[PDB]
Subunit: 199 residues, 4 copies
């Protein structure tokens, strides 16, 4: 298919002072760019392996496909989850769901914060939608393992907790990065993803 | 190119009393057949996903491809590793390599036996060839994960220690199964795989 | 406090024709006994390592502790989940919860059956209780990994799908074993575990 | 036992300009300090669980013990592997082993460099000693999984490739950090670790 690096929907500095411009420029133009490129490389090798029926070659490529393929997915969603006009709380049916499933908005933040802080190593924190049960669910994933591909849950809000997402600004203090990132969350997109899961 | 269940090179009862016909008949005609057929199904689903660039669908299918693809691979080699004319010890350059890398033939047996008994759950014990280092190496693998695809080693001799491989005859006592199987090892084939990697 | 193999609450043949006596006799007196004894051995080695602060020795032993410790746990619950007076459906608050969380009793069976058949390799299928969310949840676990220790869910009903649990009687056809086992499920005990978590 | 943060054997800035002082101060006083403290917390909970025979509690703590316990080990070794007087190449029996097992010193650097660059996520690159085979071996480990505890190999040289080890200075360009770190390698310690493995 030939995957492409999506244009960022805002200037690299639109999220200051919560997430500085230096990070956004590295995260999009270097890190995300690397996942896409290698993903394109990986898929071409796999197409060859399928045509030859080289099952060994297919399995050796799996780690690279899940890693870079996941990277493309997770960051492509992540950018839309942030916005200079973001922050505050959601409204409408999403807020009603957060109240029902978690009790309140502040308790949801605490649990998703804890999931993101609890990730041991590199990974992501996620708010997702469980189609089968029809309710919200928090989950964490290691490295770039994607939410939907590995768990079946539909991503609504993702928090990147790889050190490159915050270290330059917040150093080892991951909890400050989590507290600041709530200021730029684009609940308008999260709502769309939530409403999309329902008929 | 569709994958097919290979014919067994000997009668189902050619390995009695070491491995009874009921095991060999179920192991080949029931267990192996299902991995192959399902692999063909998975490869069709995967090819569809690759053509659309659906990275989510590709990642969700990986387990079924590694499991059944590995199952097809592992059993296809396993059958060639056994023969009614087998047993005894190898000769030639293979025996010289086993002496050099493991000390003696009896020490290699202890090491591969120990690795195979050590599998916690289902898996396989393997003697393999490390191309980069140019020597023999034993490894164990879980479920139907294939050796070469996950480790880079070239499979020479595989021991299936899934319970369906022996339970009917030896029940829970895997060490009795391991003791019996050495009498039907096709050292003529193991040598062929070994000499092929060297040049 | 040393761990001990619990006595089976019924004769080895009390579950015929659903689970023959030969399976029950091997499963309890051979398989379960080994996990317990080895667990006692592992705990002694681990206690020695902890007292010396040998973190290396502690980490190297973790697999043996999770495997045999889980094996002891899982089987000790499994035996209580079966009874010759079992079968049929549950009643009371447990049945109401199954209807609310899964739709109906027949839908819960399909979901737990599907989860148990889906185990690739050895493992267990579980119905569990999520304390935080306060509802039922199905999960599968590999090898002898215990439910509560790895997921936080309280085990209510476990289905052992290790091949030694059924192969002698049903051979490779796990769906026949799953079909038969529902007739001996001790819904009286499953309820007791459920009501204990609620207050 | 009560583990303690070892004093660093040199000033935070003794490795400039290869590894700046800001990193060394964060890496030792914040990151390494966190692993120790939580490790002490984890071991106390485990001592309680062993005395009560709470096997569930033991397994729930395993991730925390391997993570922080490994962190203490890996960094405690890492500091001794660097030195302001470091760099260059080793001599004596270690260099002879590197020539025999890898071909040359430059080829060893390429392979250990590649292993360190290849780590997907957080982890470590290692040169180790295989006691059984009596030769050197390169391996990578994810997160803080320790070499000896998980593979049996004796650590000789470890390369920390967690992003916090280099990002502030080298940003996303991990390969530059690897090229620079060769300038401060304390081969005097690596030799001691190597000679210790031999009688
Ligand atoms: Mn990222
Ligand atoms: Mn098999
Ligand atoms: Mn069992
Ligand atoms: Mn570190």
């Amino acid at each position: 298919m030939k995957h492409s690096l999506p244009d960022l929907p805002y200037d690299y500095g639109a999220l200051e002072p919560h997430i500085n411009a230096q990070i956004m420029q590295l995260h999009h133009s270097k890190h995300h760019a690397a996942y896409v490129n290698n993903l394109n490389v990986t898929e071409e090798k796999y197409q060859e392996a399928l045509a030859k029926g080289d099952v060994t070659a297919q399995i050796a490529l799996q780690p690279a496909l899940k890693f870079n393929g996941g990277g493309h997915i997770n960051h492509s969603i992540f950018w839309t989850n942030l916005s200079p006009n973001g922050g505050g709380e959601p409204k409408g049916e999403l807020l009603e769901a957060i109240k029902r499933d978690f009790g309140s908005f502040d308790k949801f933040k605490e649990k998703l914060t804890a999931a993101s802080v609890g990730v041991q190593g590199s990974g992501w924190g996620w708010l997702g939608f469980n189609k089968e049960r029809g309710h919200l669910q928090i989950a964490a994933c290691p490295n770039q393992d994607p939410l939907q591909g590995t768990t079946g849950l539909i991503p609504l809000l993702g928090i990147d907790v790889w050190e490159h997402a915050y270290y330059l600004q917040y150093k080892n203090v991951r909890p400050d990065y989590l507290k600041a990132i709530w200021n730029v969350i684009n609940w308008e997109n999260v709502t769309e993803r939530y409403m999309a899961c329902k008929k």
